Design a protein around this motif. Structure first.
Motif, mmCIF file in Angstrom:
data_model
loop_
_atom_site.group_PDB
_atom_site.id
_atom_site.type_symbol
_atom_site.label_atom_id
_atom_site.label_comp_id
_atom_site.label_asym_id
_atom_site.label_seq_id
_atom_site.Cartn_x
_atom_site.Cartn_y
_atom_site.Cartn_z
ATOM 1 N N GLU A 1 0.842 -1.188 0.000
ATOM 2 C CA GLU A 1 0.000 0.000 0.000
ATOM 3 C C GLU A 1 0.888 1.253 0.000
ATOM 4 N N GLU A 2 2.201 1.060 -0.120
ATOM 5 C CA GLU A 2 3.094 2.211 -0.226
ATOM 6 C C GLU A 2 2.862 2.955 -1.537
ATOM 7 N N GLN A 3 2.866 4.276 -1.449
ATOM 8 C CA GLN A 3 2.605 5.113 -2.600
ATOM 9 C C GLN A 3 3.551 6.299 -2.658
ATOM 10 N N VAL B 1 7.307 12.229 -2.353
ATOM 11 C CA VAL B 1 7.143 11.799 -0.976
ATOM 12 C C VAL B 1 6.648 10.364 -0.996
ATOM 13 N N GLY B 2 7.438 9.468 -0.420
ATOM 14 C CA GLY B 2 6.966 8.131 -0.165
ATOM 15 C C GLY B 2 6.173 8.067 1.120
ATOM 16 N N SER B 3 5.356 7.026 1.233
ATOM 17 C CA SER B 3 4.545 6.860 2.429
ATOM 18 C C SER B 3 5.431 6.700 3.659
ATOM 19 N N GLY B 4 5.175 7.520 4.677
ATOM 20 C CA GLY B 4 5.763 7.293 5.984
ATOM 21 C C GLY B 4 7.232 7.676 6.089
ATOM 22 N N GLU C 1 13.940 4.948 5.384
ATOM 23 C CA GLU C 1 13.590 3.796 4.558
ATOM 24 C C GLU C 1 14.784 3.285 3.755
ATOM 25 N N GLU C 2 14.659 2.052 3.264
ATOM 26 C CA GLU C 2 15.791 1.243 2.832
ATOM 27 C C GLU C 2 15.797 0.980 1.327
ATOM 28 N N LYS D 1 12.207 12.409 6.317
ATOM 29 C CA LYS D 1 10.925 12.757 5.732
ATOM 30 C C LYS D 1 10.526 11.816 4.599
ATOM 31 N N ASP D 2 11.449 10.959 4.174
ATOM 32 C CA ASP D 2 11.239 10.068 3.030
ATOM 33 C C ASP D 2 10.801 10.859 1.800
ATOM 34 N N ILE D 3 11.465 11.983 1.578
ATOM 35 C CA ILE D 3 11.174 12.855 0.451
ATOM 36 C C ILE D 3 12.361 12.827 -0.498
HETATM 37 ZN ZN LIG Z 1 9.540 4.774 1.332
#
Ligand SMILES: [Zn+2]
Ligand SMILES: [Zn+2]
Ligand SMILES: [Zn+2]
Ligand SMILES: [Zn+2]
Ligand SMILES: [Zn+2]
Ligand SMILES: [Zn+2]
Ligand SMILES: [Zn+2]
Ligand SMILES: [Zn+2]
Lengths: 226, 11, 213
Positions: free
Chosen positions: A1-3, A23-26, A29-30, A75-77
């Motif tokens: 459900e990641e967008q 921007v990724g969800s949440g 991240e890896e 921020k996963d941006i």
């Molecule tokens: Zn992500």
């Protein structure tokens, strides 16, 4: 459900700058993130890619020394800072995650794509279209079926949407991709195949909408009369 | 300096 | 980086038939080659990763294969979904897409019905003149549209536009627009668009005379 959701696109003059965000969800991240763009009616071109920890960054030669990719895990941006812009960078810009590996024959892939943000680089300026009837006549008739349409001329920028009879009529409709003029403005045509018996009976309205200039045109197309 | 390992790996 | 060239450029087949699409690299990409599918107005979608592995949900009828420079994507018996654009992609040295292979539905030859439209009178009073010739519901897509003004061939003042393949009849439609200054349009009388196409018994010419009803 990641967008993934892109923003920052828009109309800009040549030699100017724009700045896109993805921007990724949440939350880190890896995964690495990449920029992929598509010019109108053209194929995909990889713009840039940055590793998960920003330790490795690459670019296509077309944009090298003009664009700069960076990211922030907290921020996963993901960012695409765009400098020294040209008309040839006019494209739809996708943000994408493209990881795939079979190390130790352990099959793992993750492939996520945003819907993209649009980039238009030109000196031209916002203008509503000029809708003209393409009038059915003996030259537009062919054995029981007649053709009629609307010419949506000199508008900028894209898109425009064309409907017939407020969407009541959809069969036989063709709206063609816009065509870019030497002027730097767009034009298209929308035509529909209708029975030639219904020209004297049925009303035909083409609904043209140009959101950038806020232009709403409803034009009736009539048979050509003397 | 592109390594396929750096951009593709299982988290 | 590494250049990827795809063949065929366009592949025309019927559903139930089976497709072979090639992608060759200038330098070896090892096994780091993927296949993507794209349809109008949608983001691309992964089919095959690392040469031969299908993403989740990808029908078994798709299969990938190849090594180093030569690769192939096989669709064992095509569904209506599968007619779209396909891109090979390498991730051996950065990322690179091929120019794309378009998979089209093959159908029987259908001759275009041709219509010319004079420029409207509101356009002429606006100061411009556009002559539109329309080719509707034809196949194959290769068509030659020619503009004649009092039997003088035109070059450089016409622009074409083609629709996507129709979902039900699998034909194309095309418009050729003669863009002239209004001054040069009102000098001349006969405007014709001559259309040559595989399905026509001979070149079709649709013409009008400036000022006729
Ligand atoms: Zn992500
Ligand atoms: Zn395996
Ligand atoms: Zn049609
Ligand atoms: Zn290295
Ligand atoms: Zn980890
Ligand atoms: Zn390798
Ligand atoms: Zn299916
Ligand atoms: Zn003349």
């Amino acid at each position: 459900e990641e967008q993934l959701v892109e923003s920052g696109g828009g109309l800009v003059q040549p030699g100017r700058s724009l700045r896109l965000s993805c921007v990724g969800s949440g939350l880190f991240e890896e995964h690495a993130m990449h920029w992929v763009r598509q010019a109108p009616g053209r194929g995909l071109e990889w713009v840039s890619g940055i590793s998960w920890n920003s330790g490795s960054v690459g670019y296509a030669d077309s944009v090298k020394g003009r664009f700069t990719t960076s990211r922030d895990n907290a921020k996963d941006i993901l960012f695409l800072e765009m400098n020294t812009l040209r008309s040839e960078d006019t494209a739809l810009y996708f943000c994408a995650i493209m990881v795939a590996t079979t190390k130790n024959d352990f099959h793992y892939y993750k492939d996520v794509w945003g819907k993209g943000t649009t980039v238009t680089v030109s000196s031209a300026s916002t203008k509503g279209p000029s809708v003209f009837p393409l009038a059915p006549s003996s030259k537009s008739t062919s054995g029981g079926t007649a053709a009629l349409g609307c010419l949506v001329k000199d508008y900028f920028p894209e898109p425009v949407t064309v409907s017939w009879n407020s969407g009541a009529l959809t069969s036989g409709v063709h709206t063609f991709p816009a065509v870019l003029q030497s002027s730097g403005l767009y034009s298209l045509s929308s035509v529909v195949t209708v029975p030639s018996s219904s020209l004297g009976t049925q009303t035909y309205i083409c609904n043209v909408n140009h959101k950038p200039s806020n232009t709403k045109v409803d034009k009736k197309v009539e048979p050509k009369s003397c | 300096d592109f390594h396929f390992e750096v951009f593709n790996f299982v988290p | 980086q590494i250049v990827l060239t795809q063949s065929p450029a366009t592949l025309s087949l019927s559903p139930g038939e089976r497709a072979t699409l090639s992608c060759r690299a200038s330098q070896s990409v090892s096994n780091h080659l993927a296949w993507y599918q794209q349809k109008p107005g949608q983001a691309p979608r992964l089919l095959i990763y690392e040469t031969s592995n299908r993403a989740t949900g990808i029908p078994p009828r798709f299969s990938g294969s190849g090594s180093g420079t030569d690769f192939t994507l096989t669709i064992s018996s095509l569904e209506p979904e599968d007619f779209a654009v396909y891109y090979c992609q390498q991730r051996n040295n950065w990322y690179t897409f091929g120019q794309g292979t378009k998979l089209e539905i093959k159908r029987t030859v259908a001759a275009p019905s041709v219509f010319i439209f004079p420029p409207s009178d509101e356009q002429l009073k606006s100061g411009t003149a556009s002559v539109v010739c329309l080719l509707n519901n034809f196949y194959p897509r290769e068509a030659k549209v020619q503009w004649k003004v009092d039997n003088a061939l035109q070059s450089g003042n016409s622009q074409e536009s083609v629709t996507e393949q129709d979902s039900k009849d699998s034909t194309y439609s095309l418009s050729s627009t003669l863009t002239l200054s209004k001054a040069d349009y009102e000098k001349h009388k006969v405007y014709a668009c001559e259309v040559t196409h595989q399905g026509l018994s001979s070149p079709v010419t649709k013409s009008f005379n400036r000022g006729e009803c």
